[PDB]
């Protein structure tokens, strides 16, 4: 109808929900929930299930992609009712799906609602492809996308608008694994940080301040000359005492986010700059797809948001690749590649943002599955969800 | 859709189908000889010629479905004794026939028909029920 559709992009930690044709995804809240330990009615989720002390918090989207379906259905219940508010038999939907989503896993999503609220029809969208949201605002459905959220990095690239069950590898780098470092190096610094509100500070420090530095041993003197031109003090609040304590947040600001290019730098837990990993991936892909996989560099997701981040990567990825291509004109000669980063805008929590404008559209209404069609063959007829966005 | 409609696989000289071979208790032959004080033997009569010498549901729906009765208008505390009064070549035959009533519940045209079967074991053997499976010229 003349009514816009609902779109949901969940994820391991935080959950993203909303409508259709909006600048931000209405609300984003933690997915935990719980009942005691007739009973399905009593349950809370989001900025509520994290405080409940009588209910026990569990997290359904672990090990990356979607998990426990039973527990998930209760969540979806509150997402619709008491939040977005929509009579589901009247609204088209959208439930993201981490790559690798086997048919079996897809069937679980297609069902439930269709067999519960019999909502009209729903598309299950792929993360990386959606991760080409606003990057079009700064055209193509071929490129190499880094979505890296909080539990680990992700080298999810493109492929004509589909998944590449092969060309992708993960690196144990995560927003939190940055945090361990910032907080760790801070421990040896100024004292006064309660162990209990320690995590608090790490999550906060990473957000409120941190940034990327072009060169390492570069500013590391400017930052000792003009110490009073960047060195600030965090205004944290105590817990049991509730006393306010200020510390001088300094090097960790730019000396921490640097754990991206040298993951091995904080703790040894990894052996390769991220840019380099990307190279392994791109050159390992079929040539007739390696070229385009260089002019399209996108970020997006809860860990890619950092000042001067986007700039430093193109250069770093480019110098190594240029160096490799040098070792080839020694046979004379080839066409020098050409990388490039992309920092559109809604990089914070994209994906939702993308899909939604492009699902606010009639096209979504073409490839989307109809209710009557669901009661025909069943739910299986949803395992494959055709792409739509270029010529269409 | 055209030549794939025809099915010759059913005309292959080498395909194989059983030799179609083709009478039964007389609706009253033993009936009378039952009505008296004989609820322990006479009912065995229902054996004279088994539906196997001719086809058609007609004979199987009557001369063959005649034995459905007897056991129906029975009691219970007297079933086993009848069964042991049989041998290898007279016990299983009652099982195959048991299955006919079990195929046509017809609500009343069946009722129970589980007792004689439960007690059918102990003497016929777990094979009795299985033996029925391997039977070309069934009831």
């Amino acid at each position: 109808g003349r009514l816009p559709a609902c779109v949901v992009d969940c994820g391991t930690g935080y959950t993203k929900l909303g409508y259709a044709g909006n600048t931000e995804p209405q609300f984003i809240i933690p997915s935990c929930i719980a009942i005691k330990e007739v009973d399905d009615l009593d349950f809370f989720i989001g900025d509520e299930a994290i405080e409940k002390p009588t209910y026990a918090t569990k997290w359904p989207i672990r090990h990356g992609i979607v998990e426990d379906w039973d527990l998930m259905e209760r969540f979806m219940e509150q997402v619709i009712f008491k939040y977005l508010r929509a009579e589901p038999e009247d609204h088209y939907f959208l439930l993201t799906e981490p790559p690798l989503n086997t048919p079996e896993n897809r069937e679980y999503t297609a069902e439930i609602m269709f067999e519960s609220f019999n909502v009209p029809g729903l598309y299950i969208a792929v993360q990386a492809v959606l991760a080409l949201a606003a990057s079009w605002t700064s055209r193509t459905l071929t490129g190499t996308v880094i979505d890296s959220g909080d539990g680990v990095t992700h080298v999810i690239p493109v492929a004509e608008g589909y998944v590449i069950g092969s060309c992708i590898k993960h690196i144990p780098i995560a927003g939190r694994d940055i945090t361990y470092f910032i907080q760790q190096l801070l421990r040896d610094r100024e004292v006064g940080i309660p162990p209990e509100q320690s995590l608090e500070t790490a999550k906060a420090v990473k957000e409120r301040y941190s940034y990327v530095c072009p060169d390492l041993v570069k500013e590391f003197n400017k930052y000792d000359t003009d110490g009073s031109k960047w060195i600030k003090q965090y205004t944290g609040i105590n817990a049991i005492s509730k006393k306010e304590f200020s510390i001088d947040v300094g090097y960790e600001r730019f000396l921490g986010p640097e754990i991206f290019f040298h993951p091995e730098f904080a703790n040894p837990d990894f052996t390769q700059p991220i840019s380099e990993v990307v190279d392994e991936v791109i050159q390992n892909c079929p040539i007739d797809v390696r070229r385009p996989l260089y002019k399209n560099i996108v970020l997006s997701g809860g860990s890619t948001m950092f000042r001067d981040f986007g700039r430093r990567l193109q250069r770093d990825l480019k110098r190594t690749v240029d160096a490799r291509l040098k070792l080839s004109e020694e046979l004379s000669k080839p066409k020098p590649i050409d990388v490039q980063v992309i920092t559109h805008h809604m990089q914070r929590y994209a994906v939702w943002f993308g899909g939604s404008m492009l699902a606010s559209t009639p096209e979504f209404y073409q490839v989307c599955h109809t209710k009557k069609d669901y009661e025909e063959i069943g739910p299986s007829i949803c395992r494959h969800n055709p792409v739509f966005g270029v010529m269409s | 859709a055209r030549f794939r409609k025809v099915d010759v696989d059913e005309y292959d000289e080498n395909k194989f189908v059983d030799e179609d071979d083709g009478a039964g208790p007389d609706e009253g032959e033993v009936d009378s000889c039952l009505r008296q004080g004989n609820m322990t033997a006479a009912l065995q009569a229902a054996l004279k010629n088994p539906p196997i010498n001719t086809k058609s549901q007609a004979v199987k729906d009557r001369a063959g479905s005649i034995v459905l009765k007897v056991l129906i208008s029975f009691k219970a505390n007297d079933i086993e004794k009848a069964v042991q009064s049989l041998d290898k070549n007279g016990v299983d035959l009652l099982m195959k026939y048991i299955y006919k009533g079990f195929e046509s519940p017809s609500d009343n045209s069946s009722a129970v028909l589980l007792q004689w079967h439960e007690k059918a074991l102990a003497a016929g053997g777990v094979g009795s029920i299985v033996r029925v499976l391997t039977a070309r010229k069934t009831v």
Binding site: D188, R189, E190, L216, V217, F220, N221, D248, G250, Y251, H262, E264, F265, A266, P268 | -
Partner: protein
């Protein structure tokens, strides 16, 4: 990766398993008068920031090797310097904390045996011990001020902390 040495000229006679470059010091320098605005000592100061954090250095030049000794020496300036009341107090330590004959390449007490090897002789060695010494003294006084602050009793409430992390994890002190 990390940062190595920039100055390596053929004049630097390959001494033992290192270089032998000179530096700008006011005390016992067995190497000529560096005419640059940035000598070995300066190279270390402008670095070490990502040294300890880095775990995969590549020996490019023997100057890198000298730089490496000095970077490692910086560590002593904390076991017995980090906890020193006022800078005018940790100065005397430089003598003892510097003169204290350290396990030169070759010793039953010295780590980093890899690229390191003492000259298996008694001429290059005893003589090598004299370069290996001015650092223990010049690299210290020429380092206390830059690391510290014009303030007293404040070994830079930011540097006097890097005491818990060491380059490549190799205890040059114990």
């Amino acid at each position: 990766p990390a940062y190595h040495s920039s100055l390596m000229d053929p004049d630097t006679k390959l001494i033992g398993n290192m270089a032998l470059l000179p530096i700008r010091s006011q005390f016992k320098g067995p190497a000529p008068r560096e005419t640059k605005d940035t000598d070995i000592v300066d190279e270390a100061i402008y670095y070490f920031k990502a040294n300890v954090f880095f775990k995969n250095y590549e020996i490019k030049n023997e100057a890198d090797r000298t730089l490496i000794y000095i970077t490692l020496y910086i560590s002593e300036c904390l076991k017995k310097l980090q906890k020193c009341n006022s800078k005018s107090q940790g100065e005397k330590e430089m003598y003892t904390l510097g003169i204290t004959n350290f396990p030169i390449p070759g010793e039953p007490g010295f780590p980093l045996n890899a690229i390191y090897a003492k000259p298996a002789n008694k001429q290059e060695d005893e003589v090598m011990r004299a370069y290996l010494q001015q650092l223990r003294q010049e690299t210290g006084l020429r380092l206390c001020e830059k690391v510290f602050d014009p303030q007293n009793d404040k070994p830079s409430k930011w540097w006097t902390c890097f005491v818990k992390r060491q380059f490549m994890n190799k205890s040059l002190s114990g």
